[PDB]
Amino acid sequence: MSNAEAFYASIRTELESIRAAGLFKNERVIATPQGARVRTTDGREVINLCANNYLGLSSHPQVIEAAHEALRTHGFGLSSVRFICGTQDLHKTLEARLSAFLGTEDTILYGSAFDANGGLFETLLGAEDAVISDALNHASIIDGVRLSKARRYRYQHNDMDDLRVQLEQARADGARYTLVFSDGVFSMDGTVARLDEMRAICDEYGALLGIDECHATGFMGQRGRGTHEARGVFGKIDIITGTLGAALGGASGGFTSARKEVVALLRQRSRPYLFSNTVAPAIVGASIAVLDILEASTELRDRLEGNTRFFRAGLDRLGFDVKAGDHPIIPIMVYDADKAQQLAQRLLELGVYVVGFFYPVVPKGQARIRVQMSALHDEAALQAALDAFGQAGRELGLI
């Protein structure tokens, strides 16, 4: 045996254990645009309830037309990081619209939220500083922290008391600056961070407050500005990282929004911004259209909140356990991974499209279906999906 081929056997062994544990993930091949209804390459039309397309913007024809126009005026790719020849007028324009929307001085675009998190902490913090994370923070945040030299603290999920004991330890350990950082809305359970309480704890210790708004920007708060708007601390957030790939168009791209001098150091020093391609023109141009849509009317935001309130009461009525609260992320816990796989594949036979979350996406013993509400769902699709959730939801033992 050569070491190389041996390595391929340990890879094949790992792939077979993952199957055996029922933890293997099967891709489904959609053949149409992203939509509240969608058809896979088998011709079966189904109702999509597991997309980050909260506002219906991923195939919105005005967003589509803005991409078409931005291709005619601004080309297909730039093939350059921002500082060489990758900055068009669109990137500056969008950065100003994002900053105004989010309530901040400035904004720096990234290829993804993953990279915005990836290049945030290492640029702003050093070995003498501390970051204190909610224990449920998105993987991209964990990896951004791991790439920094800062001292690390984690506090129990949404546990404000634990947040206080960590800031005490952090101060006891002699932290210089301290950044408290959390998902604005948590990906896997839909809970909303208590930014109002966390603003207060932070001011008391003198710590910065950052949030990751991938599941909030565009539809949280009455004006859809985000978790910080929904919790009364709009204009009082040190650092907003977020995505363009969810409620604001769903194509690609991300951002960090902060004061002008934080953003300025990120342009000078943040490794995904120096060493990774700029956002494509068509994506930036459509993103500007998305901010016009949302600053002219809260109709999509409001319609989304209605579909969630309808569909959450609906799942409550059937004896399903309504995790979290107002949010469009409805996590239907099943704990066992195999049941999650069964329920998802049985809902596909009943014409509903959701998928199973299990390790490593969610902790072991905590598998689930994440149902996601879009503003685009019609009553027929929703009342139909409730039936399909009812049948399978009894036909497999969930109640």
Ligand X SMILES: Cc1ncc(COP(=O)(O)O)c(CN[C@H](C(=O)O)[C@H](C)O)c1O
Q: What is d(CA 119, CA 113) in angstroms, rounded to the nearest whole number?
A: 10
Distance of closest approach, residue 285 Cβ to its own copies, in angstroms: 11
Residue 10 interacting partner from ligand X, its own copies, none (CB closer than 5 to 8 Å by kind): its own copies
Assess whether the previous peptide bond of 272 is cis (omega < 30° from 0).
Answer: no
Task: Return the range that interacts with ligand X (CB under 6 A); candidates 151-159, 201-209, 274-282, 376-384.
Answer: 274-282
380: its two tokens: 């027929």
Single residue of 44, 73, 321, 364 touching its own copies by CB under 8 A: 73
Q: Does 280 bind ligand X (CB under 6 A)?
A: no
Distance of closest approach, residue 23 Cβ to ligand X, in angstroms: 15
Interface of this chain with its own copies, residues 256 to 275, rule: CB under 8 A: 259, 261-262, 264-265, 267-269, 271-272, 274-275
Q: What is d(CA 39, CA 42) in angstroms, rounded to the nearest whole number?
A: 8
* Rounded (10°) CA dihedral 373, 137, 104, 228: 60
Distance of closest approach, residue 143 Cβ to its own copies, in angstroms: 6
H-helix or E-strand spanning residue 380: helix 379-395
Question: If you search the block for the tokens 């984690």, which residue do you land on?
Answer: 154
Single residue of 93, 156, 277, 391 touching ligand X by CB under 6 A: 277
Q: Which of 208/211 has CB closer to its own copies?
A: 208
Q: What 8-state DSSP symbol labels residue 346?
A: H
Q: What 8-state DSSP symbol labels residue 25?
A: -
Residue 183 interacting partner from ligand X, its own copies, none (CB closer than 5 to 8 Å by kind): ligand X
What Å distances lie between residue 35 and 61, 208, 248, 351, CA to CA? 12, 39, 14, 14
Nearest to 288 by CA among 263, 260, 253: 253
Interface of this chain with its own copies, residues 121 to 140, rule: CB under 8 A: 124, 138-140
Q: What angle do CA 30, 250, 296 make, to 5 degrees?
A: 130
Q: Which of 203/316 has CB closer to its own copies?
A: 203
Burial bucket for residue 7 (CB in 10 Å: 0-12, 13-18, 19+)? exposed
Interface of this chain with its own copies, residues 13 to 72, rule: CB under 8 A: 14-15, 18, 23-25, 27-35, 38, 41, 48, 50-54, 57-60, 63-64, 67-68, 71-72
Q: Which of 104/187 has CB closer to ligand X?
A: 187
Q: What is d(CA 30, CA 58) in angstroms, rounded to the nearest whole number?
A: 14
Q: Which of 6/200 has CB closer to its own copies?
A: 6
Distance of closest approach, residue 311 Cβ to its own copies, in angstroms: 17
Q: Does 82 bind ligand X (CB under 6 A)?
A: no
Residue 118 interacting partner from ligand X, its own copies, none (CB closer than 5 to 8 Å by kind): its own copies
Interface of this chain with ligand X, residues 165 to 224, rule: CB under 6 A: 183, 187, 212, 214-215
Distance of closest approach, residue 206 Cβ to ligand X, in angstroms: 26
Q: What is d(CA 371, CA 342) in angstroms, rounded to the nearest whole number?
A: 15
Q: Does 140 bind ligand X (CB under 6 A)?
A: yes
Q: What is d(CA 66, CA 289) in angstroms, rounded to the nearest whole number?
A: 6
Q: Does 138 bind ligand X (CB under 6 A)?
A: yes
Q: Residues for the chain: how many in total? A: 399
Interface of this chain with ligand X, residues 6 to 45, rule: CB under 6 A: none
Residue 34 interacting partner from its own copies, ligand X, none (CB closer than 5 to 8 Å by kind): its own copies
